[PDB]
Amino acid sequence: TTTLAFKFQHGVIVAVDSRATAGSYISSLRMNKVIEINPYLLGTMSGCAADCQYWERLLAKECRLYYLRNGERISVSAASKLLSNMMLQYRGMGLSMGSMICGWDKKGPGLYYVDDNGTRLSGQMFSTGSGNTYAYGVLDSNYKWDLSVEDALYLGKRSILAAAHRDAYSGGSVNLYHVTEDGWIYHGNHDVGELFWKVKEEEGSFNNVIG
Amino acid sequence: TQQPIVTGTSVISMKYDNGVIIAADNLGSYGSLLRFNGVERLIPVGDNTVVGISGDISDMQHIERLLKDLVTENAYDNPLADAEEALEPSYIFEYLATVMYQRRSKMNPLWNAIIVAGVQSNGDQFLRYVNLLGVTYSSPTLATGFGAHMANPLLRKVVDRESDIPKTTVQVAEEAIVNAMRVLYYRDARSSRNFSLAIIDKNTGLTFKKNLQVENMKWDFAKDIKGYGTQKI
Amino acid sequence: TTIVGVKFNNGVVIAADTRSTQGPIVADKNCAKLHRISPKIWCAGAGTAADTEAVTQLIGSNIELHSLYTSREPRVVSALQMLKQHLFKYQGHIGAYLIVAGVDPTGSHLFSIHAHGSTDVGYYLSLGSGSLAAMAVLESHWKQDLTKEEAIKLASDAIQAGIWNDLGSGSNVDVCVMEIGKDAEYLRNYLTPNVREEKQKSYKFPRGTTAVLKESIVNICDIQEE
Amino acid sequence: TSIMAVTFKDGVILGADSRTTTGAYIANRVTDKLTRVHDKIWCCRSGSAADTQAIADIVQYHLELYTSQYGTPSTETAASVFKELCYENKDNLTAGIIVAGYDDKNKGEVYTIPLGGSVHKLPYAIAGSGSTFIYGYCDKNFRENMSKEETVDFIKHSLSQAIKWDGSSGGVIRMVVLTAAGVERLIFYPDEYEQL
Amino acid sequence: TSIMAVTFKDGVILGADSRTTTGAYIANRVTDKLTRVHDKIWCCRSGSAADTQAIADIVQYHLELYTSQYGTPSTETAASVFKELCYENKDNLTAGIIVAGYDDKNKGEVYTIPLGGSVHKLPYAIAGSGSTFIYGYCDKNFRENMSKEETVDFIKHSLSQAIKWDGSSGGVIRMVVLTAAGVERLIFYPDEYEQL
Amino acid sequence: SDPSSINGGIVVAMTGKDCVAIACDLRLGSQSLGVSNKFEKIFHYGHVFLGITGLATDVTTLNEMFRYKTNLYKLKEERAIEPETFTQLVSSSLYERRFGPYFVGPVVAGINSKSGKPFIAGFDLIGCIDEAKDFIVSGTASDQLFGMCESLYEPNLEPEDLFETISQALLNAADRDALSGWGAVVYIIKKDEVVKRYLKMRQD
Amino acid sequence: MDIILGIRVQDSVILASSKAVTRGISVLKDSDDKTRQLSPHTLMSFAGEAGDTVQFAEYIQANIQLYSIREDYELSPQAVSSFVRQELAKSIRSRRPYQVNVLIGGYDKKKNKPELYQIDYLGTKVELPYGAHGYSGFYTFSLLDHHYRPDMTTEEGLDLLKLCVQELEKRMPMDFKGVIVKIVDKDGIRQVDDF
Amino acid sequence: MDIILGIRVQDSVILASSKAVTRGISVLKDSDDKTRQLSPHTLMSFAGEAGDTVQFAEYIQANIQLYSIREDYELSPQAVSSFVRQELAKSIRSRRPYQVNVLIGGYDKKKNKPELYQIDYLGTKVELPYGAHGYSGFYTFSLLDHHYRPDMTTEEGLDLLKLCVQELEKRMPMDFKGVIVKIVDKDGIRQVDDF
Amino acid sequence: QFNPYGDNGGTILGIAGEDFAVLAGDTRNITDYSINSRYEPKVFDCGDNIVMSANGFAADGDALVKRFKNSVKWYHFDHNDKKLSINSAARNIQHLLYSRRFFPYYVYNIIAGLDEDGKGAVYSFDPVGSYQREQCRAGGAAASLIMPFLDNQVNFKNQYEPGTNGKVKKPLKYLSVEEVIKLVRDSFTSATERHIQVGDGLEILIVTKDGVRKEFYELKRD
Ligand SMILES: *[C@@]([C])([C][O])[C@](*)(=O)[C]([C]C1=[C][C]=[C][C]=[C]1)[N]C(=O)[C]([C]C1=[C][N]C2=C1[C]=[C][C]=[C]2)[N]C(=O)[C]([C])[N]C(=O)C1=C([C])C2=C([C]1)[C]=[C][C]=[C]2
Ligand SMILES: [Mg+2]
Ligand SMILES: [Mg+2]
Ligand SMILES: [Mg+2]
Ligand SMILES: [Mg+2]
């Protein structure tokens, strides 16, 4: 996999690939690596698929119970911490999970990286999975806070494409999300095969590839 | 986790038109040592079921006691213990299968391979296998250990599929089983000449044959065989 | 692999299945496991397939040169001795397990040979993953003073046992009959009990289905005149 | 495997079972473990079949060449050739060989060559996986200068017990009698020796 | 170790050597391997001395408590208590025990309990590292309903051979005779049994 | 670690009516990293075609070696080598390194210039020949290729139909393998004309 | 050693190679030149196991210089790359293989074209517009895939190269102490002294 | 994590801690604050295995804050350091020990003295004028041994600290992305925003 | 050392239609190179119009199916005989699998049926509990042989419309139950040829609004 997420002026972009592998065999062409915890909270998935699905769906249970008890939406900071504390219970037991908790709360847009070690980091931009290095290259050189919603969506889409191309264990399709103060907005499933040829022509990139 | 010490080799079985046949030799091996020569590895449960066991003998004796206790427990507060509410082969098998799978799940298995042969209340033939892993399967012919490699091929020539069962008589089926036991005696280094055979028929009931021997063996051709290649004398 | 060798009245017969595998995958559905060492000495091999071929070709080559040198027809004991001494030297690293059979001026012969260099003599033998299934048939039905027709039947029945009951064996049955005072008859695909049934559908595509970027003529001819 | 060689009044007798195993599978049930290296010098083989066959073949070659140059070799000489091969290649071999032969001068002799390549001249010798079970029986029942028929019975009874307890042993009991009269091969089937 | 128990006309006799080794060092050359769990129920021990002593002590406790409540226990019952301990603790034990006892109803009985914890009722039993060498001898020489003197000779000759070939066995031959008459202890020294 | 799956790649060959086809992907990688999308795995020595999968250094090395040997063959024999003969040369050359082998899965394809008979063959890394009538597969998606070929293939296909069958067999097998893809090439071979087509496929 | 990069533009080849040399936990040198001139228009950068790298590079250098003198002629970059590949392919099955990865940047004076060849220690050769060894490509190839054109100038090639080094300096845990950059074109080989 | 330094001057304690956080081969963050305020005049920096560090630091923080509320009183740095040491010494013989090394910088308001305590994951406590964990001391202690006086000002302490970081940046193979520096004195805890 | 796991071979295939679904699987059961049974059912009717197959280690497969069938029974008891929807069954199965995260059920599970809108549905699981709804899925021994064929012949991957040359894709027209069964039979016939663990027999369970129907077909026994 490749996943990314970044904060900007108009909220937070979330982009992931859809490939799943069992060794060198591509087990799945289209797997959903984002979880809709609530209208204002998202979770990315990298590592063991089962671990990612189980624990982040269990987080949604716990985030939902927070709302019922307090009559108020949980913060991104608190949600990320609940998850990191779950990981800390199964410390050294062999869980493999890398996720970014993305959302909007009273402090504004929030983004937290969380992994199986219990590591919990706040930040502007993150990328996880086998292809994160390829995505970071595009992100770092093209990122600004002053990005428009249209350009930001494209950056995250293009950054996944970069990784999908080079990384053998990333690809399939790109799933896009945009998080606002009114909630998250799904911006579709984009096949990499079709997207690659389109970007190559329009952008002029991938000159070395013949098409 | 353990290792098997005193062991029993192949158990072989097959279905025929009116019932099932099962057989197993009377040997208890201690590695390469043929230590115990009077071991019964077919254990009847009532008059409608025979459980054949291979593998570790100490675990076999434990299973033998569980079955003996199962009969006792089924009779408790049961006026129909010798009739409608008697133990069926399917009940006995599922019990064992439950035990085997639980034990493997605790990483402390009963180091056995078991075949439950019998006839149900409605006359249907019952033949199913279970082992130390809790793996279960059924087939017109079943065999454990070496029997799976050498006996099944011979028995499947008689009953190759389900439709061959009504066409197979008890004389033909017994003949096939007895021939298979001879072949195993030729080729299994952990086998013995002495064996037991059991027939469970829906009409004639349970027939249990002890102290059977492998006979009509071919050895004469050995005299002509000399050396390992070039030697003539 | 399933292979057998059976002696009879005036000669010897060998047989084999036709499946070759790459683990659980079938690479070749109609492999040829019956190899020729000399015209009337044939062997059949299990184990490492390249080793059984290479070692068979090598010894067969040296046997031919020996036959030319001595002005005599090759003997099975010669092939046997040359094979075992070669295999012993490589201490089992050449994974060749063979059944060697043939006729020569001395008579009819049947041997087995293992990868480490040990040889055996017998009237009926079996090698490979299906050896036990085949041997069960041989021990059930073999007898002294078999005829040619009875031995071919026994041999193919033994291979069938392997085909049906062993996952490492399958497809067809090959046979070679070596009778004294006769040419050896190689019966390729003597039995064909595993023909694939007709498919339910034709998967022939419409022309133009596949997307193409570039086309070009490949020059396979040499440099031209003028 | 169960093998033995026994000296007696008129010469020496070699005896062996016929079972060859690959684990628990009996690869050959009618094996001939009594192998000839010279007219009246035979050996019994135990251990790796590949190793023992290769050795016996080389020894047979050495004794054929010895005979062409120097005449009929002694049993001691044959045992020395076995030893030299087993001892110098001990790191790459697994061979336990019993050598037995007849001279008119020395009569019946028996030499045993265990794993290390040592040589031991004995009145009788036992070897193979099944030999362990008959150390007590053979020690109690062996006598020097037995008759041919007494010696055949001794080997038959001994190997019968070895076969009875050892799963790696079995099949028929082959024997080879070495005397001035010549070379006699014997065979005894299960129905005979099992009921002893 | 070389141990055995043999039934005969008047009851049963247990026999054993007296050697205990720590590798090649003989830690005790006069060991008593014949151990009493009840008046007329004794056992022969093989394997880990710590394990077999701990088991026999526990069994002795169970049979003492059985006797206080239900009267004199059978030999079968004693063997069942041994079995239950050896079988349920098989992962942490290395014990090979032969159980032997006398009733007036059942007379002389012998049960052997090898490593796994299985039980086998037999006419006679042999066990220990030295037993391997006398499987053939004992099978050939054992008869049912022997006299006391015949049975003593059988055990003496058998263990003599086991001691002769097994380095882990040796010392004196101890025996315990179990009959209606009572309990008789016997001992046989090297100078007696070595010359057999 | 496994030499046969470090660089990745696949090759497939099929027989048709008076024709043969051989195809390969263009990927070369260092495990997860894609390095080249122009690494062609099919070579030709006269009218005999050789596809090689596996360790890229050995692929390159063997091509150079068979070029060496076929050029000498031609100088001495005064004629181009035939597919049947070349197949034996490949087998021989691989087995001479029995205990230090080239980590490759070669595939021969061609038409005998005299008989006109189409010919294909495959080998293991050690030289064992697989002379199939229908098709030969090799590479990291060999399991995938076996499934596609076995279901899509039918005998006596015409060149332009065979093209579609082999192309779809390769393309869809490559799309279920992480270590294969990044382009594809198909050779359509007839007795005296050979066409080479680059396929359009997904580049992930 | 660690990072070596290469890029082929319109009329030249640019090679960038790290300056760091580490021994134990200490950086012994921060100005090391991981390259050898094989011929006036052919440059080879290298990275791999300590000691082996320089020994291999100098051995190749000696062989190409010997060829140049013997024939009074400069071998093409393609010919040199093939010679180097064969030596590595020969080496990988030796008793003790040379663990060296190389980039060969050369200007072919016959064809008037720049050429970049990437060869790893196994003898795996590929001609590329841009290349790298080890982990360097993981960070940089996405930038090169995006920004690279074949008609780029040498100055544009250097700017794209700076962006690659900046990305490496940001996302690598490894301090490689900057890079020495060298340009190979029709006029020969020269070093960019300010980078 | 990697580098944490500490120095006790005349009237304050200065802690410097690296900003880098690495996961796999990628630097995920270059602005991470590896420290927690235990009380108004006590600061603890930490370094060790991923996840364990923050969990341990926050657990200690909670305990000291609980004590502060219960007694309406701030524990001395010495008392806090002893509490922390015991927790680590308790931890090292647990089923799964916490692999965390800490520096505790505090100003004792009773004695009017700065105090620096170095504690490793085994529970090995030492009071020092300057300290470090891991490999940091190998590069820096020679400079500190030379330049350190006990009557140094806070500004002189920062200058000596800069020299230590410069030496680390030169001789370490590791890019730790600079340091966050914090000062602990009578007026409390503050961060040096430009370093 | 005791190995609690084993491999019983076999291969399974689930395809979702427009208003139907199929779940197929071969009937061969094996260990190593031996055949245990030529007919050992692997696909089961679990009630509530749901079919299920747990392929891999048969003992774990039987245990899971047995537990899910039990879960359906208790769902009726606890929730007033309410029908267990396919999506609800799928989520329940995830929790059954993850309850053994640290000693997994060694099986690749597939279920099939109809969603609450009456449309065909297939859900597929890994051994530890990751699941997702799919249109097409082959599982088990010959999964890698079959899936590419289904990508091509069910979703028309890499197929374009003649004349356009790669510009226009082949349109994704729906498949009938008769067309799907043809693709299933050809998938298993092809898998039987090239995979030694596949053969003997093929059993297909078809699910519609009318209920669950069975179809059996012979396969090669070599
Ligand atoms: C990259 C593709 C590679 O790592 C990415 O990380 C994905 C993330 C992902 C997250 C949620 C859902 C799907 C994918 N990871 C995987 O695909 C992982 C990688 C992996 C395999 N083993 C392993 C991994 C990671 C860490 C430790 C160990 N792959 C899996 O989890 C494997 C086990 N799963 C499958 O192959 C299948 C899944 C999931 C699935 C299958 C097979 C079938 C039906 C439904 C789901
Ligand atoms: Mg002694
Ligand atoms: Mg990719
Ligand atoms: Mg310290
Ligand atoms: Mg078969």
PDB file of C-alpha atoms in Angstrom, chain E residues 20-167:
ATOM      1  CA  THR E  20      23.118 -46.954  38.692  1.00  0.00           C
ATOM      2  CA  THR E  21      25.189 -44.815  36.318  1.00  0.00           C
ATOM      3  CA  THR E  22      25.852 -41.134  35.726  1.00  0.00           C
ATOM      4  CA  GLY E  23      27.229 -41.419  32.204  1.00  0.00           C
ATOM      5  CA  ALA E  24      30.048 -43.957  32.495  1.00  0.00           C
ATOM      6  CA  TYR E  25      30.569 -43.487  36.253  1.00  0.00           C
ATOM      7  CA  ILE E  26      28.822 -46.049  38.447  1.00  0.00           C
ATOM      8  CA  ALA E  27      27.222 -43.857  41.133  1.00  0.00           C
ATOM      9  CA  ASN E  28      25.842 -46.894  42.979  1.00  0.00           C
ATOM     10  CA  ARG E  29      26.785 -50.539  42.354  1.00  0.00           C
ATOM     11  CA  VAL E  30      24.443 -52.049  44.973  1.00  0.00           C
ATOM     12  CA  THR E  31      21.173 -50.276  44.135  1.00  0.00           C
ATOM     13  CA  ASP E  32      17.843 -51.803  45.159  1.00  0.00           C
ATOM     14  CA  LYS E  33      15.576 -51.400  42.131  1.00  0.00           C
ATOM     15  CA  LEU E  34      12.891 -53.716  43.525  1.00  0.00           C
ATOM     16  CA  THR E  35      10.510 -51.425  45.370  1.00  0.00           C
ATOM     17  CA  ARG E  36       7.518 -52.186  47.526  1.00  0.00           C
ATOM     18  CA  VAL E  37       4.261 -50.270  47.083  1.00  0.00           C
ATOM     19  CA  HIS E  38       2.189 -52.804  49.042  1.00  0.00           C
ATOM     20  CA  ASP E  39       2.750 -55.976  51.116  1.00  0.00           C
ATOM     21  CA  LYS E  40       2.588 -58.197  48.016  1.00  0.00           C
ATOM     22  CA  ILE E  41       2.655 -55.617  45.212  1.00  0.00           C
ATOM     23  CA  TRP E  42       6.145 -54.636  44.109  1.00  0.00           C
ATOM     24  CA  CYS E  43       7.529 -52.790  41.105  1.00  0.00           C
ATOM     25  CA  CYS E  44      10.717 -52.626  39.055  1.00  0.00           C
ATOM     26  CA  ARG E  45      11.890 -49.138  38.100  1.00  0.00           C
ATOM     27  CA  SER E  46      13.650 -47.870  34.974  1.00  0.00           C
ATOM     28  CA  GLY E  47      14.302 -44.367  33.623  1.00  0.00           C
ATOM     29  CA  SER E  48      14.845 -41.274  35.771  1.00  0.00           C
ATOM     30  CA  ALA E  49      15.523 -42.384  39.362  1.00  0.00           C
ATOM     31  CA  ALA E  50      14.037 -39.127  40.681  1.00  0.00           C
ATOM     32  CA  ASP E  51      10.845 -39.607  38.649  1.00  0.00           C
ATOM     33  CA  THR E  52      10.398 -43.322  39.431  1.00  0.00           C
ATOM     34  CA  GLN E  53      11.047 -42.832  43.169  1.00  0.00           C
ATOM     35  CA  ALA E  54       8.574 -39.936  43.330  1.00  0.00           C
ATOM     36  CA  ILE E  55       5.932 -41.998  41.505  1.00  0.00           C
ATOM     37  CA  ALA E  56       6.413 -45.148  43.590  1.00  0.00           C
ATOM     38  CA  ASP E  57       6.201 -43.041  46.773  1.00  0.00           C
ATOM     39  CA  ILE E  58       2.921 -41.459  45.608  1.00  0.00           C
ATOM     40  CA  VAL E  59       1.547 -44.875  44.583  1.00  0.00           C
ATOM     41  CA  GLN E  60       2.510 -46.321  47.981  1.00  0.00           C
ATOM     42  CA  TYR E  61       0.559 -43.455  49.568  1.00  0.00           C
ATOM     43  CA  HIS E  62      -2.520 -44.108  47.387  1.00  0.00           C
ATOM     44  CA  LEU E  63      -2.502 -47.854  48.133  1.00  0.00           C
ATOM     45  CA  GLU E  64      -2.042 -47.291  51.877  1.00  0.00           C
ATOM     46  CA  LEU E  65      -5.091 -45.010  51.807  1.00  0.00           C
ATOM     47  CA  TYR E  66      -6.996 -47.444  49.561  1.00  0.00           C
ATOM     48  CA  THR E  67      -6.314 -50.229  52.072  1.00  0.00           C
ATOM     49  CA  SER E  68      -7.548 -48.168  55.033  1.00  0.00           C
ATOM     50  CA  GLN E  69     -10.891 -47.600  53.278  1.00  0.00           C
ATOM     51  CA  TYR E  70     -11.576 -50.528  50.927  1.00  0.00           C
ATOM     52  CA  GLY E  71      -9.201 -53.339  51.969  1.00  0.00           C
ATOM     53  CA  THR E  72      -6.363 -55.002  50.057  1.00  0.00           C
ATOM     54  CA  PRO E  73      -6.067 -53.618  46.489  1.00  0.00           C
ATOM     55  CA  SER E  74      -5.592 -55.764  43.394  1.00  0.00           C
ATOM     56  CA  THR E  75      -2.428 -55.749  41.283  1.00  0.00           C
ATOM     57  CA  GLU E  76      -4.529 -54.318  38.432  1.00  0.00           C
ATOM     58  CA  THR E  77      -5.581 -51.433  40.700  1.00  0.00           C
ATOM     59  CA  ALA E  78      -1.949 -50.695  41.614  1.00  0.00           C
ATOM     60  CA  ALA E  79      -0.973 -50.701  37.932  1.00  0.00           C
ATOM     61  CA  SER E  80      -3.839 -48.283  37.222  1.00  0.00           C
ATOM     62  CA  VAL E  81      -2.515 -45.797  39.795  1.00  0.00           C
ATOM     63  CA  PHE E  82       0.974 -46.044  38.243  1.00  0.00           C
ATOM     64  CA  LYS E  83      -0.553 -45.587  34.783  1.00  0.00           C
ATOM     65  CA  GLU E  84      -2.660 -42.574  35.754  1.00  0.00           C
ATOM     66  CA  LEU E  85       0.481 -40.824  37.039  1.00  0.00           C
ATOM     67  CA  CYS E  86       2.732 -41.857  34.137  1.00  0.00           C
ATOM     68  CA  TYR E  87       0.130 -41.037  31.466  1.00  0.00           C
ATOM     69  CA  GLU E  88      -1.126 -37.658  32.742  1.00  0.00           C
ATOM     70  CA  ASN E  89       2.433 -36.417  33.429  1.00  0.00           C
ATOM     71  CA  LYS E  90       4.070 -37.965  30.343  1.00  0.00           C
ATOM     72  CA  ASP E  91       5.542 -34.630  29.165  1.00  0.00           C
ATOM     73  CA  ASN E  92       7.535 -34.193  32.400  1.00  0.00           C
ATOM     74  CA  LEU E  93       8.434 -37.819  33.166  1.00  0.00           C
ATOM     75  CA  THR E  94      10.856 -40.471  32.000  1.00  0.00           C
ATOM     76  CA  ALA E  95       9.698 -43.631  33.762  1.00  0.00           C
ATOM     77  CA  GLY E  96       9.428 -47.251  32.621  1.00  0.00           C
ATOM     78  CA  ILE E  97       7.830 -49.328  35.365  1.00  0.00           C
ATOM     79  CA  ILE E  98       7.000 -53.026  35.695  1.00  0.00           C
ATOM     80  CA  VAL E  99       4.310 -53.805  38.280  1.00  0.00           C
ATOM     81  CA  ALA E 100       4.035 -57.271  39.827  1.00  0.00           C
ATOM     82  CA  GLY E 101       1.843 -58.653  42.611  1.00  0.00           C
ATOM     83  CA  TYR E 102       0.127 -61.657  44.171  1.00  0.00           C
ATOM     84  CA  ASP E 103      -3.531 -62.186  45.069  1.00  0.00           C
ATOM     85  CA  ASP E 104      -5.069 -65.451  46.274  1.00  0.00           C
ATOM     86  CA  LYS E 105      -7.884 -64.999  43.742  1.00  0.00           C
ATOM     87  CA  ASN E 106      -5.924 -63.709  40.724  1.00  0.00           C
ATOM     88  CA  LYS E 107      -2.576 -65.266  41.769  1.00  0.00           C
ATOM     89  CA  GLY E 108       0.567 -63.841  40.091  1.00  0.00           C
ATOM     90  CA  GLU E 109       0.086 -60.958  37.647  1.00  0.00           C
ATOM     91  CA  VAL E 110       2.510 -58.749  35.704  1.00  0.00           C
ATOM     92  CA  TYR E 111       1.831 -55.330  34.178  1.00  0.00           C
ATOM     93  CA  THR E 112       4.359 -53.279  32.213  1.00  0.00           C
ATOM     94  CA  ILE E 113       4.063 -49.508  31.827  1.00  0.00           C
ATOM     95  CA  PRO E 114       6.444 -48.090  29.192  1.00  0.00           C
ATOM     96  CA  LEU E 115       7.268 -44.417  28.502  1.00  0.00           C
ATOM     97  CA  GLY E 116       3.933 -43.198  27.080  1.00  0.00           C
ATOM     98  CA  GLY E 117       1.853 -44.393  30.046  1.00  0.00           C
ATOM     99  CA  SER E 118       0.190 -47.344  28.301  1.00  0.00           C
ATOM    100  CA  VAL E 119      -0.558 -50.531  30.274  1.00  0.00           C
ATOM    101  CA  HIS E 120       0.114 -54.075  29.115  1.00  0.00           C
ATOM    102  CA  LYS E 121      -0.725 -57.194  31.116  1.00  0.00           C
ATOM    103  CA  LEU E 122       1.719 -60.013  30.328  1.00  0.00           C
ATOM    104  CA  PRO E 123       2.929 -63.474  31.447  1.00  0.00           C
ATOM    105  CA  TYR E 124       6.392 -61.959  31.841  1.00  0.00           C
ATOM    106  CA  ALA E 125       7.973 -58.584  31.113  1.00  0.00           C
ATOM    107  CA  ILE E 126      11.442 -57.178  30.538  1.00  0.00           C
ATOM    108  CA  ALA E 127      12.595 -53.559  30.585  1.00  0.00           C
ATOM    109  CA  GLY E 128      15.592 -51.265  30.972  1.00  0.00           C
ATOM    110  CA  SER E 129      18.540 -50.573  28.672  1.00  0.00           C
ATOM    111  CA  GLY E 130      19.788 -54.173  29.010  1.00  0.00           C
ATOM    112  CA  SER E 131      16.465 -55.788  28.064  1.00  0.00           C
ATOM    113  CA  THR E 132      17.188 -55.308  24.335  1.00  0.00           C
ATOM    114  CA  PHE E 133      19.926 -57.967  24.432  1.00  0.00           C
ATOM    115  CA  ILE E 134      17.685 -60.707  25.887  1.00  0.00           C
ATOM    116  CA  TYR E 135      14.454 -60.397  23.859  1.00  0.00           C
ATOM    117  CA  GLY E 136      15.495 -63.456  21.855  1.00  0.00           C
ATOM    118  CA  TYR E 137      16.723 -65.459  24.840  1.00  0.00           C
ATOM    119  CA  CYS E 138      13.654 -64.772  27.011  1.00  0.00           C
ATOM    120  CA  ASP E 139      11.165 -65.486  24.204  1.00  0.00           C
ATOM    121  CA  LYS E 140      12.841 -68.839  23.503  1.00  0.00           C
ATOM    122  CA  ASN E 141      13.228 -69.953  27.128  1.00  0.00           C
ATOM    123  CA  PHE E 142      10.026 -68.739  28.827  1.00  0.00           C
ATOM    124  CA  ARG E 143       7.275 -71.249  29.621  1.00  0.00           C
ATOM    125  CA  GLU E 144       4.002 -70.801  31.509  1.00  0.00           C
ATOM    126  CA  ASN E 145       3.468 -72.468  34.905  1.00  0.00           C
ATOM    127  CA  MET E 146       7.168 -72.959  35.672  1.00  0.00           C
ATOM    128  CA  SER E 147       8.317 -73.973  39.149  1.00  0.00           C
ATOM    129  CA  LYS E 148       9.900 -71.509  41.573  1.00  0.00           C
ATOM    130  CA  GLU E 149      13.378 -72.953  40.954  1.00  0.00           C
ATOM    131  CA  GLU E 150      12.881 -72.969  37.163  1.00  0.00           C
ATOM    132  CA  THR E 151      11.736 -69.330  37.254  1.00  0.00           C
ATOM    133  CA  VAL E 152      14.671 -68.252  39.438  1.00  0.00           C
ATOM    134  CA  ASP E 153      17.066 -69.907  36.971  1.00  0.00           C
ATOM    135  CA  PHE E 154      15.298 -68.233  34.026  1.00  0.00           C
ATOM    136  CA  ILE E 155      15.621 -64.749  35.548  1.00  0.00           C
ATOM    137  CA  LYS E 156      19.196 -65.446  36.662  1.00  0.00           C
ATOM    138  CA  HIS E 157      20.307 -66.608  33.204  1.00  0.00           C
ATOM    139  CA  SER E 158      18.431 -63.774  31.469  1.00  0.00           C
ATOM    140  CA  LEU E 159      19.788 -60.923  33.604  1.00  0.00           C
ATOM    141  CA  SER E 160      23.236 -62.551  33.448  1.00  0.00           C
ATOM    142  CA  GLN E 161      23.258 -61.980  29.672  1.00  0.00           C
ATOM    143  CA  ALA E 162      21.796 -58.471  29.948  1.00  0.00           C
ATOM    144  CA  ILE E 163      24.564 -57.552  32.413  1.00  0.00           C
ATOM    145  CA  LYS E 164      27.159 -59.200  30.160  1.00  0.00           C
ATOM    146  CA  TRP E 165      26.348 -56.991  27.158  1.00  0.00           C
ATOM    147  CA  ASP E 166      24.905 -53.815  28.730  1.00  0.00           C
ATOM    148  CA  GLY E 167      27.430 -51.536  30.454  1.00  0.00           C
TER     149      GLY E 167
END
